[PDB]
Ligand binder design. Sequence first.
Ligand SMILES: [Mg+2]
Ligand SMILES: [Zn+2]
Length: 334
Amino acid sequence: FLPIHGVETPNDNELEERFSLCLDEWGVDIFEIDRLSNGHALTTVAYRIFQKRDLLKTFCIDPHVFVRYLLRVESTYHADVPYHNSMHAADVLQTAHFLLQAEALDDVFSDLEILAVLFAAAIHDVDHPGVTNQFLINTGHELALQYNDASVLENHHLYMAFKILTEKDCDIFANLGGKKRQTLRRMVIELVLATDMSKHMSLLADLRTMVETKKVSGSGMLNLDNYADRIQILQNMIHCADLSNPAKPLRLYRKWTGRLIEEFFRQGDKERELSLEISPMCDRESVEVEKSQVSFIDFVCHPLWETWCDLVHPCAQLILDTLEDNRDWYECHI
Ligand SMILES: [Mg+2]
Ligand SMILES: [Zn+2]
């Protein structure tokens, strides 16, 4: 008695068509999936990916339960936050689903590790209030005091996703063994913590380490039986996915960017209003959109994707190309 896409929609055959051809593609139109499904990108994309990877069958997750949990997660994203809402989460979830398909990663990950990274992706920004970690620290907000300045929002997103599992008939993980639930919980934690930006430099250093260890190996592929290595990859992977907008098709990159800048400007408006110094990129009086994108691509996004593409060489070529064309496009619109 379950609609073909988990929750009901006005546009079932269109959506079937989009999901059937697009979900293993780089560069999916999450905004249209959202409009076509009446606000339910997250729930629909997640339902379909978990069906497509056989994850309901594999972990005995009741599909009514999955759907209800996601509907609640989706509701606890804030629709009025311009960028960090459930469409962002649907994007990151699909993108991570894509980056798992690279031929150089076939049979490296257990199914529980796949489950972890995709669940993490779906929840990684749940309840975001549209302000950065630095803002919450700089303002002495309750959350920053509580988490002692460390991964403030990421910790909070995790808290909210786990409380929701409690609620009546929402525990998708109910039929997993005890030592699995606890293993999964450990991974999901580590994965959503890896989306905190202040870990960027550290993760990228571990990822290059592992690139260098693959270039010098006798059999040009990596010993990935150590769980500690695997989880590093997966930490980088969900962070790549979170920083994927500048490597998406130009039109989608620009839509994502207009939203991000509106979020940032609103935060600068709150800073101005409290006599605080205005965060980078948050100042509507002073900021220069194009120059900020070129500099973010040069200093953060390109060196991350370059190293990722080097690990999975050559299965992520299109990413790096689209990223570079986007860089150049933004440079000559300065
Ligand atoms: Mg985040
Ligand atoms: Zn995010």
